[PDB]
Amino acid sequence: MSLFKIRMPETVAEGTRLALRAFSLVVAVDEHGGIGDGRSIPWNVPEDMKFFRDLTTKLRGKNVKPSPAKRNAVVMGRKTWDSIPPKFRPLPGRLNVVLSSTLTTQHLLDGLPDEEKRNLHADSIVAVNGGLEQALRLLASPNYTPSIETVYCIGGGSVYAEALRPPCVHLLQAIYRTTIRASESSCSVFFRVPESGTEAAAGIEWQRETISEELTSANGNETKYYFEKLIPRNREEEQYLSLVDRIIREGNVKHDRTGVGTLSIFGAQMRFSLRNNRLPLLTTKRVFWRGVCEELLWFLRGETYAKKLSDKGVHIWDDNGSRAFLDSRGLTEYEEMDLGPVYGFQWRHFGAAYTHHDANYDGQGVDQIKAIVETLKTNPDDRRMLFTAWNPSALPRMALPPCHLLAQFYVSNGELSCMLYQRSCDMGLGVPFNIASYALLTILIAKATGLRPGELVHTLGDAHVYSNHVEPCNEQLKRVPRAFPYLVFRREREFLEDYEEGDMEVIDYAPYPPIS
Amino acid sequence: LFKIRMPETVAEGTRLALRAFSLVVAVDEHGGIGDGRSIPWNVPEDMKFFRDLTTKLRGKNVKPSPAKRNAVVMGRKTWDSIPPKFRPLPGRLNVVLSSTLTTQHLLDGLPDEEKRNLHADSIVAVNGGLEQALRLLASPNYTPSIETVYCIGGGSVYAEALRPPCVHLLQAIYRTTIRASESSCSVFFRVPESGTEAAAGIEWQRETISEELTSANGNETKYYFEKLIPRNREEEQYLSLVDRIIREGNVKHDRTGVGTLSIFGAQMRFSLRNNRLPLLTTKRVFWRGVCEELLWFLRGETYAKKLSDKGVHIWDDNGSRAFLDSRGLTEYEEMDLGPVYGFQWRHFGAAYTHHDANYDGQGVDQIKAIVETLKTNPDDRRMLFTAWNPSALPRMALPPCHLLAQFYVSNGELSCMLYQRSCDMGLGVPFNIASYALLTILIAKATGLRPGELVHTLGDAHVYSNHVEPCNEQLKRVPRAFPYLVFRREREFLEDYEEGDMEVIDYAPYPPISMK
Ligand SMILES: NC(=O)C1=CN([C@@H]2O[C@H](COP(=O)(O)OP(=O)(O)OC[C@H]3O[C@@H](n4cnc5c(N)ncnc54)[C@H](OP(=O)(O)O)[C@@H]3O)[C@@H](O)[C@H]2O)C=CC1
């Protein structure tokens, strides 16, 4: 359509490029915090060693063994790489990234005992002339992201130091620390977690997710040790968990005509950071992001024919798209799964006359989306940049009124912010989905106007919890939220409407398992 | 037929149960009101203070007439204490609580008949306690004619005012403490402590406390004043948001050079229960304008001359032959704004020619439909109306600032959520909280429901650059208790309601900002 469509700008890829890849950290220390006796660890512990081996090699989803197209990487200082017997070098099943200003990828290769091995481990060994940051940077490249599932900082006194301070600390998703109660090993380097509220912690609040019971090693000195997984507390996801909990403890009970019950409160707001490629996909329960992605893209394109979603295996619109339901809405003239002028149609053709989904609508009605894209690039402080699908005229003609019916954009310091207005909000499955959807829209719109993603604000109206969801939503409440993942684009397009779900990839999403 | 008919529960939805009052009292360093047998301390300054506060009216120009005067409530014992030759307290309605004395009884106790008749109007007895007295001053005879009620005494009455239900109605407490040389007392005055059950959620705070004064009564009596008020967290919601904006907002500049400090996304809640009217107290809100424009809105009016003809020129700038022409609205008579606000509320989508046309029946009447769903299916999650119509903004003098509102019904109370895109914290927001509270209250009256809560959601919240100094001044004032809204008479239809049908009682805002 070209002119009917919104042409992505040249900076399209400039304000969304992953600058630094997210990672985790594995480490062992003594009761005093020591980590290494200068070049060695005077305390090799069987259990801890197997743990490091398992943690760093295994992938999310059991039954999938590492391979060259999907594996984990480890980043280590040169002195650490040097402390590994050349015979066990490199650590198998992972991409070994070494920090060195004296050794090149080639040199590390030379170090391996024979040629054969040097060739057999060629794609598993690369040097980086820089510290952690330049390594995390190298990793974010198209070649390693999403290729490398998880990056693990396996250590080195200087790497751990770079990792625990801005900027690399803002990407540290988890800290796995093994504490061995050594009989005496007072080393040199102390590994310490910045305490909450101090300047060092840089605003981050590290809280345990899990702590193991004190254990006894099968080694020679029955050494005692324990494990701990530490994560950067997530206030953002907590807003959500707090609101669900309040609805369950204080919400009002209501049963509709169907006998469908719900607990609910009225009026609420949430904030979600969208900077540096941050996607707020909730962690205490996996979110259907492919479903989320396909539908948002479905929106911006002005679609109304749900079959396109159900063909790509997304069935969120079947119930409300059937013949039976449509007939109950008086839309007996609509093809099955032809919802009418809903969501997207009102976004790109407000007030246009609707007939059937396959008709030509180009140039019809007010294309709100195309004007907001144009105003942001010429008058970013305009206070009237908002779209609505809430059209009282077209409403009866719709399969049903839109739940997320209003959105507004704000600009400050080149950062695109978006406010959302959801009249009805199902906390259990609806709200998380909607948070992902609008987060995506702000990113895609940001990329189209030459701005950086900022924040997503969410205004809830009637936000409920189904009765049939109270218990499972209670189980979930137990879990403490983990760090959010990030989304990257593997390719850009010429027009906003051209983006496909595959063009982007969600990296480092470690959501808790399905509630039992 | 086009107008919204009021139900017969119209008056019951907002009947003023108890009228709001204040309490004046004197105590010694132990909290001794007196030895139950007359206050042993005549501290002249206190007497003139008492006389001044309880007699004068806010209108620093009106004299106490039976049509507009202050009331004074006291127990029989306190009324006896008043020298017969000085009964009743002149210039104030004397309200006496007694289970034996009668309106005629009190009267006869006064000597000469000349005053026994000139004061039949300023004396009245109530056979019951304080709670009954406030319920009696809430009748149409006293509210709003009585500008303010003053519980002036009796240990039994003070105790009642300090406990529910009467406390929830106490606007303030004036307490003078005397350095008592005589401890001859027995009953102690005590303001419930913050957080204790006795305080019933109310947190009493000092607005003012004087320095130690010395009476010219020849005894060197040391004494001091106090003005305690119920903490108004709700207005502090607004005071805080302004502080935050002024303190950390994004300074932007219009294309005309006009400056603003801003933040995007905020929310505020306001209780509309029991005739509570959330009119900020830190700066007087023009209620006569609010009320008239809202009414103007409900009627679906599009002609501002009708509002300017009532001393409300808020739309005179956008009603200019000049402004209008810029908008290309060349064929619009002056002051004809086009299909804005009200028009989209009652006629969404109708084609607009001139404010003269008859629109009855045209477009969608969002208000009607809500009022109906409200009385038959109060749980429906689609009770919201919008003024944001992209196909018709270009024909509007201006696009709506407060563009969307939704309703929610719980326990028979009506709540409302307002969405305002641009928000002038300096003048609009305060005005807009007023309007939508009024709107919510009237909607309740129209649907046999009780006013619940008003939720205010903001988009671009800003403080105009040249308002910093004034707002900073206002921020120094501790918010006072919100006033109450009442209704002298009712109506057969909602479009019929006139500004003079409701009265705003007990509104004691702080004086104008000394903007030198
Ligand atoms: N308890 C535990 O879990 C662990 C303990 N250890 C212990 O720690 C000690 C090793 O720590 P340490 O001596 O700090 O060694 P490291 O393993 O951190 O190696 C440091 C080396 O990494 C390189 N490097 C680091 N930062 C940069 C940078 N910004 N730019 C370029 N190169 C960089 C340099 O290589 P180059 O010299 O080539 O320029 C450098 O000398 C040992 O005693 C080991 O046993 C190690 C890992 C884990």
Ligand SMILES: NC(=O)C1=CN([C@@H]2O[C@H](COP(=O)(O)OP(=O)(O)OC[C@H]3O[C@@H](n4cnc5c(N)ncnc54)[C@H](OP(=O)(O)O)[C@@H]3O)[C@@H](O)[C@H]2O)C=CC1
């Ligand atoms: N220092 C100060 O600031 C003040 C000092 N005082 C002094 O304190 C003393 C007040 O006496 P105290 O007994 O505490 O209180 P009151 O003066 O309130 O006298 C109580 C009397 O008020 C009436 N009353 C109270 N509650 C009810 C009710 N629910 N229904 C009907 N009638 C009711 C009764 O009249 P009845 O017996 O006829 O039924 C009752 O005996 C006085 O001596 C007065 O001078 C008073 C005010 C202020």
Ligand SMILES: CC1(C)N=C(N)N=C(N)N1c1ccc(Cl)cc1
């Ligand atoms: C096994 C050990 C000591 N334990 C932990 N927790 N973390 C590490 N990074 N380790 C480690 C792994 C490999 C190398 Cl080369 C050095 C230390």
Ligand SMILES: CC1(C)N=C(N)N=C(N)N1c1ccc(Cl)cc1
């Ligand atoms: C003047 C005095 C003592 N002082 C205060 N602060 N409050 C009262 N209510 N007073 C009072 C007024 C009238 C009567 Cl009859 C009794 C006490």
